[PDB]
Amino acid sequence: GVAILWHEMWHEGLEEASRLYFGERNVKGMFEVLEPLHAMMERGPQTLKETSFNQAYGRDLMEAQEWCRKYMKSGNVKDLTQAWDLYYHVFRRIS
Amino acid sequence: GVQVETISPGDGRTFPKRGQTCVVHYTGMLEDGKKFDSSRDRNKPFKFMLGKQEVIRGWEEGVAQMSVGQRAKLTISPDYAYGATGHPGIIPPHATLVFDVELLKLE
Ligand SMILES: CO[C@H]1C[C@@H]2CC[C@@H](C)[C@@](O)(O2)C(=O)C(=O)N2CCCC[C@H]2C(=O)O[C@H]([C@H](C)C[C@@H]2CC[C@@H](O)[C@H](OC)C2)C[C@@H](O)[C@H](C)/C=C(\C)[C@@H](O)[C@@H](OC)C(=O)[C@H](C)C[C@H](C)/C=C/C=C/C=C/1C
């Protein structure tokens, strides 16, 4: 059970990142889980399964990152709440 | 703890078993009445699985005793919500919360 496919990686990543932020108030830790996963997407899809994942969920995940980056400048936690609304939508669809 | 007061009745029969996802509409507000979150305002219900510690204790115990179609006022103690830490930038420390929640269906 090593998470190799993108939906597997995002599912375990979003679970862990939410546990850090909502469970433990650890914004830094949340970002340390998420930033690498977004960077993986930004490298681009390499396989067919990555391509179809990207077509389904790429826009939503990209927008969640923009809300997080809004938070980085604003400091307004409501912007992280927006991001988590988008991340939860992805999480349910890949569960 | 949590106090459940029925606003609108459900069927009084279909209660959520563990394993099922509860689909709800909610409106969360502080003790004074100021809203902090509402699924109704977004026009998109909230889905979550019960008894997995997914949500705050007031929901875990409160929503468990609701029937399908029921709408209720959940007054939740701070130790049954976010406690001393709170939820930074939304819910402060030692906050009594009030949720107007409607159990729409189970999936
Ligand atoms: C975009 O919106 C936010 C919710 C905002 C966030 C800010 C809030 C003030 C408030 O505005 O909702 C609010 O109204 C509220 O108070 N709610 C929401 C309605 C249910 C009752 C109550 C309320 O308990 O919510 C909860 C506590 C925040 C955290 C939890 C309290 C119990 C404690 O054990 C948890 O430790 C891990 C932390 C948030 C829940 O909703 C979501 C669905 C659950 C979690 C984040 C965790 O379980 C998580 O674990 C690892 C999961 O498994 C999920 C399924 C993983 C997934 C990848 C992330 C989902 C994130 C969704 C975020 C949403 C929907």
Author numbering:
A (entry chain B): 2018 to 2112
B (entry chain A): 2 to 108
Sentences from the paper on this structure:
Rapamycin and a structurally related immuno-suppressive natural product FK-506 (tacrolimus) 2(16,17) bind to a family of FK binding proteins (FKBP), which catalyze cis–trans isomerization of proline amide bonds found in peptides. The most abundant FKBP in the cytoplasm is a 12 kDa protein termed FKBP12.21 FK-506 bound to FKPB12 mediates immunosuppressive activity by binding to calcineurin and preventing translocation of Nuclear factor of activated T-cells (NFAT) into the nucleus. Thereafter, independent studies identified a mammalian homologue of TOR.25−27 In time, this homologue became known as mammalian Target of Rapamycin (mTOR) or, more recently, mechanistic Target of Rapamycin. As previously outlined, mTORC1 associates with auxiliary protein Raptor (149 kDa) while mTORC2 associates with the auxiliary proteins Rictor (192 kDa) and Sin1. To address these limitations, we have developed a novel class of “bi-steric inhibitors” that interact with both the orthosteric and the allosteric binding sites in order to deepen the inhibition of mTORC1 while also preserving selectivity for mTORC1 over mTORC2.
Due to the prevalence of a seco-product when bi-steric inhibitors containing a C32 carbonyl were dosed to rodents or when subjected to mildly basic conditions, we sought to prepare additional compounds that would be less susceptible to forming a ring-opened degradant. To test if modifying the C32 carbonyl of rapamycin was a viable direction, we reduced the carbonyl to a hydroxyl group to give compound 11(81−83) and also formed the C32 methyl ether to give compound 12.54 We then measured the affinity of rapamycin 1 together with compounds 11 and 12 for FKBP12 and affinity for FKBP12-FRB. In addition, to understand the differences in binding affinities between the rapamycin analogs 11 and 12, crystal structures of the ternary complex of FKBP12, the FRB domain of mTOR and compounds 11 and 12, were solved to 2.8 and 3.1 Å, respectively. Elaboration of C32 to the methyl ether results in a ∼1600-fold decrease in affinity for FKBP12 with methyl ether 12 (Kd = 701 nM) relative to rapamyicin 1 (Kd = 0.44 nM). However, by replacing the methoxy with a C32 hydroxyl group with compound 11, the steric bulk was removed and an intramolecular hydrogen bond with the adjacent C34 ester oxygen was formed, which results in a 30-fold decrease in affinity for FKBP12 (Kd = 13.3 nM) relative to rapamycin 1 (Kd = 0.44 nM). Despite these differences in FKBP12 Kd binding, modified rapamycin cores 11 and 12 were potent in a FKBP12-FRB TR-FRET assay (EC50 < 10 nM), all being measured at the assay detection limit (entries 2 and 3); however, differences in the affinity were observed through pS6K inhibition. The C32 hydroxyl 11 maintained comparable activity with rapamycin 1 (pS6K IC50 = 0.04 nM for 11 and 0.06 nM for 1), whereas the C32 methyl ether resulted in a 6-fold decrease in potency (pS6K IC50 = 0.37 nM for 12).
